[PDB]
Amino acid sequence: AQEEEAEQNLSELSGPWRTVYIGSTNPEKIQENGPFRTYFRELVFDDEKGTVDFYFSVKRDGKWKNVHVKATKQDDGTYVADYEGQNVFKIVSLSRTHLVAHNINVDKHGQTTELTELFVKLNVEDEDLEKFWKLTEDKGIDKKNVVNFLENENHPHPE
Amino acid sequence: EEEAEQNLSELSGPWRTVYIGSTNPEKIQENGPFRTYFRELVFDDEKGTVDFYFSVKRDGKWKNVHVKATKQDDGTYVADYEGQNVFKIVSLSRTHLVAHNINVDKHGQTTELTELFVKLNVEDEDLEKFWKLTEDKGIDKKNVVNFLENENHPH
Ligand SMILES: CCCCCCCCCCC=O
Ligand SMILES: CCCCCCCCCCC=O
């Protein structure tokens, strides 16, 4: 017998995520305009399908693009996904607060690059949303006159 | 296992805006001066102040703004930004900030806004784990980009 099945419950982890650090064996890949200079926006874990959907922004030729990539868990435990080539990636450490992964990318030229990354979750608690809503009610503000900044078609550019 | 000491200044660092509500919708609509995307906050216990670092789009262009708020003996804060402001922190932890602000603009108009902000905490253990992983893969520290500081210092 090899290893045994892993009880996986990461659904709890879906939500807003941000990129802290991304390291690379090939710096050109992460330098400005690089394909893996990805600013995470959201992550969605599905335990039924055993998938991870990545939502992130990347600048391509002085222009910002919002990308969506779906990764699928393999019986190996790793995940594979198509983005600027082929990737096999591995969650080395994941918790409600963080995420450290190792990705191996093979581009359209067969060039292999190993990347490392630290990502953090933007945790918005219920106890706090309530407190903000109450206050907002008290001050007589209308829910319609409130702007959601954690998801809007008009935000700042990291560069 | 291990947690840093609790300090006000220790809450200093990257913060992000979640929601902001207003009595005058024009203040937080596109191009409104209060449609502020927080980048960082620095609490200073000695001077009794809070420094706001945020971004706001004006005349179609994103601008980086810094505002120094000063605590009052009564615990609230004053700050000059698009008129005079009297800021009140209704709840604050290492995780969140809920606050009420009253702004009177240069023309004497009064707007009351509410806001919910959240902090981006990057824990030591996770940082070291990223670097350990990074050196295990033979990646040189000079070959790593700090995305968080870029986000905190856009343009
Ligand atoms: C790269 C962003 C998402 C699509 C490609 C598969 C791996 C991403 C993991 C993050 C990069 O280290
Ligand atoms: C409103 C100004 C008073 C102090 C800080 C103002 C800038 C951010 C708006 C605060 C809302 O909570």
From Swiss-Prot, chain A:
GO terms for biological process: sensory perception of smell. It comes from the Eukaryota. Signal peptide: none annotated. It is found in: Secreted. SUPFAM superfamilies: Lipocalins. The keyword Secreted applies. Its main location: secreted. It holds the Pfam family Lipocalin. Keywords: Olfaction, Secreted, Sensory transduction, Transport. GO terms for molecular function: odorant binding; small molecule binding. The keyword Secreted applies. GO terms for cellular component: extracellular space. Belongs to the calycin superfamily. Lipocalin family. PANTHER family: LIPOCALIN (PTHR11430), ODORANT-BINDING PROTEIN 1A-RELATED (PTHR11430:SF65). This protein binds a wide variety of chemical odorants. This is Odorant-binding protein. It comes from Bos taurus.
